[PDB]
Design a protein around this nucleic acid. Sequence first.
RNA 1: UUGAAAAGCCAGUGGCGCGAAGCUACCGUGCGCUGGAUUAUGACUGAACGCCUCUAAGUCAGAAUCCGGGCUAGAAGCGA
Length: 191
Amino acid sequence: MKTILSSETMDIPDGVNIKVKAKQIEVEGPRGKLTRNFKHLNLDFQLIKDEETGKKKLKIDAWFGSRKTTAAIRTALSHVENLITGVTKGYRYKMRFVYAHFPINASISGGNKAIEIRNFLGEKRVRKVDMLEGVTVVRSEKVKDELVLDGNDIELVSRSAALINQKCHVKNKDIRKFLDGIYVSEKGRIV
RNA sequence: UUGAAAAGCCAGUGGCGCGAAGCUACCGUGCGCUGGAUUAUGACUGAACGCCUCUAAGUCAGAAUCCGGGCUAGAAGCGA
Ligand SMILES: [K+]
């Protein structure tokens, strides 16, 4: 029914710099740089500075927006929160190898930017996966048959994990019985 | 049949054997191709709906599929 004003605000930690211009959000922190293009959202983004204190707030609002349009405000705020988390703490995904008979042989290429899977269900084919930008994959030493993906972009890290998982799908078998694969087991922050 | 020999000719290709050349047969030989976008499907982050959610915004992989490329032709189209 076109609610007049739907607004939501988020606090910004003092250790992160943020710039907004034409719905282009630039985030800077100790771990590096992140960028997002929110041009596809018909929302108004504003950065409020507290002169007396010096703190930062990001306010996103929609005017005369329907429910569908208003649903994007929280999405944008969560995306900005994820950017801040990635630039301050970073993102770490953990994957575990699951197999019944054939151990999965994983080889990490140079730079921790590519992975080779060789013995999935005793298959002679070699599966190649390349990590996305800013995401590095390593083989854990404290946990058996575990892969650690570290990055600054939650979306890129999760997409790399999804690529690894989907590259090892079982076919022509009852997947309920043949549970072999590589699956995401934990999501968290590097620090 | 030309007197004979030799050498020819007629029987509309006289008949038979071999027969080069050309043509020709899976009856012989050579060759027949790879970038993008996507369907179904499976997923990422993510609200709506403080949780959840492949979906609402955004995003990924994806086919004897489509498009392009390659091959054939080359327009009251054109260049040096
Ligand atoms: K989800």
